[PDB]
Design an enzyme around this catalytic site. Structure first.
Site, PDB file in Angstrom:
ATOM      1  CB  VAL A  75       6.617  28.750  48.296  1.00 19.29           C
ATOM      2  CG1 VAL A  75       5.459  29.644  48.702  1.00 19.29           C
ATOM      3  CG2 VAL A  75       7.729  29.574  47.670  1.00 19.29           C
ATOM      4  N   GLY A  76       9.322  26.912  49.394  1.00 18.16           N
ATOM      5  CA  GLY A  76      10.234  25.858  48.996  1.00 18.16           C
ATOM      6  C   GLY A  76      11.635  26.023  49.548  1.00 18.16           C
ATOM      7  NE  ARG A  77      12.663  20.970  50.738  1.00 19.86           N
ATOM      8  CZ  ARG A  77      12.838  19.865  50.020  1.00 19.86           C
ATOM      9  NH1 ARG A  77      13.955  19.688  49.323  1.00 19.86           N
ATOM     10  NH2 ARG A  77      11.892  18.937  49.992  1.00 19.86           N
ATOM     11  N   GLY A  78      15.952  24.299  48.881  1.00 26.74           N
ATOM     12  CA  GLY A  78      16.808  23.491  48.038  1.00 26.74           C
ATOM     13  C   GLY A  78      18.248  23.602  48.479  1.00 26.74           C
ATOM     14  CE  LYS A  79      20.930  19.895  44.855  1.00 24.70           C
ATOM     15  NZ  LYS A  79      21.417  18.887  43.869  1.00 24.70           N
ATOM     16  CE1 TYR A  80      24.237  24.158  44.529  1.00 24.60           C
ATOM     17  CE2 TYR A  80      22.450  23.648  42.997  1.00 24.60           C
ATOM     18  CZ  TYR A  80      23.728  23.402  43.484  1.00 24.60           C
ATOM     19  OH  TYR A  80      24.493  22.395  42.938  1.00 24.60           O
ATOM     20  CB  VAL A 109      11.870  29.426  47.242  1.00 19.46           C
ATOM     21  CG1 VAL A 109      11.154  30.308  46.243  1.00 19.46           C
ATOM     22  CG2 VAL A 109      13.110  28.779  46.619  1.00 19.46           C
ATOM     23  CE  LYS A 146      13.516  30.701  42.508  1.00 13.81           C
ATOM     24  NZ  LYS A 146      13.145  29.249  42.647  1.00 13.81           N
ATOM     25  CG  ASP A 158      18.126  21.665  37.062  1.00 12.18           C
ATOM     26  OD1 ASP A 158      17.867  20.441  37.046  1.00 12.18           O
ATOM     27  OD2 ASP A 158      18.101  22.337  38.116  1.00 12.18           O
TER      28      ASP A 158
END
Ligand SMILES: N#Cc1cnn2c(Nc3ccccc3)nc(NCc3ccc(Cl)cc3)nc12
Length: 328
Positions: free
Chosen positions: A40-45, A48, A63, A151
């Site tokens: 459902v998502g992705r990020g630098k850390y 997901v 995550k 954040d």
């Protein structure tokens, strides 16, 4: 020197067990309990995924963390545990790791979120007041527990619009507040970074999140995504100054004896304060009432010490109907 005006001594009065997160001994769960259902998502850390607990067949969020320092991961875990059960605070359900790669995964409660990019434009006046009020509950709670989120942004506020349920997530940048401590200004996401971070004021506090909230609020009522659209940290301050004006900035800098980097000072230039109503248009007319403006004005102040605290914000007349409704 700067200190928070409220909850300054929370971690002073509490046992080391509460804030000494590096002493935390992580208890791992069983990775096989959770299976991926879809990304459902992705990020630098992290990556997901919507997942499911094979034991109870209940949805969850997985995550999968990219390489991270023991210190950093223990901080996020400790904070999630301290805030467990708090109003609208995302629940950490489990913590697991892959033995061979040692890859850790954090298991959270599932929230059927509607991307803010599509959701916010459909929100009514009341929806905005309602959701911002709910987010405020979470902020006052964590601040009251001696924690700064650092954040706050739409990407970290999950909302199941159908169920009108909100959760503040991704506490990987959060920190415990200690009177006078100097923190890293490299937190929050650019469009929501407060002036303190942009001018290198390190002894900031809970008030940083209130600027971030204000940015979100401004974005909603004015229908702008985001409200302060800068390309880098220096340009971010410029976009802010072109709205609040340089007079306010200079006063801020002189109060905390801060000197802008010459290049930065050059980029900011000189600007006049622009009335909030100058951002009203046919699209955001049904959302920019005097109460909304008054509230926004009390959040977006250069001086972090002048901004409303989360508790004060919740009592502003702007939210009176939301409050009256709740006490029913
Ligand atoms: N902890 C936690 C947590 C709880 N729910 N949740 C969700 N829910 C979700 C469900 C369906 C679709 C999309 C998200 N996404 C993300 N992170 C991914 C993400 C995706 C889009 C946006 Cl805009 C923001 C975040 N983190 C979380």
């Amino acid at each position: 020197m700067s200190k928070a005006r409220v909850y300054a001594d929370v971690n002073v009065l509490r046992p080391k067990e509460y804030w000494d997160y590096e002493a935390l001994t992580v208890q791992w769960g069983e990775q096989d309990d959770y299976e991926v259902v879809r990304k459902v998502g992705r990020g630098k850390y992290s990556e997901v995924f919507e997942g499911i607990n094979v034991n109870n067949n209940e949805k969850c969020i997985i995550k999968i963390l990219k390489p991270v320092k023991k210190k950093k991961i223990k901080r996020e875990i400790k904070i999630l545990q301290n805030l467990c059960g708090g109003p609208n605070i995302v629940k950490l359900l489990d913590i697991v790791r892959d033995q061979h790669s040692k890859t850790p995964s954090l298991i959270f409660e599932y929230v059927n979120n509607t991307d803010f990019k599509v959701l916010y434009p459909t929100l009514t006046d009341y929806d905005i007041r309602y959701y911002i009020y709910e987010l405020l509950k979470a902020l006052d709670y964590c601040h009251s527990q001696g924690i700064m989120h650092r954040d706050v942004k739409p990407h970290n506020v999950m909302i199941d619009h159908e169920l009108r349920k909100l959760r503040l997530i991704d506490w990987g940048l959060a920190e415990f507040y200690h009177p006078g401590k100097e923190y890293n200004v490299r937190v929050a996401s650019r469009y929501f970074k407060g002036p303190e971070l942009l001018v290198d004021l390190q002894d900031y506090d809970y008030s940083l999140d209130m600027w971030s909230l204000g940015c979100m609020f401004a974005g909603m009522i004015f229908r702008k995504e985001p409200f302060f659209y800068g390309h880098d940290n220096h340009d971010q301050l410029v976009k802010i100054a072109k709205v609040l004006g340089t007079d306010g900035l200079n006063a801020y800098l002189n109060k905390y004896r801060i000197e802008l980097d010459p290049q930065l000072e050059a980029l900011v230039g000189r600007h006049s304060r622009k009335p909030w109503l100058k951002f009203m248009n046919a699209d955001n007319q049904h959302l920019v009432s005097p109460e909304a403006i008054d509230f926004l004005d009390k959040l977006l102040r250069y001086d972090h010490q002048e901004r409303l605290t989360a508790l004060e914000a919740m009592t502003h007349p702007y939210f009176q109907q939301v409050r009256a409704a709740e006490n029913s």
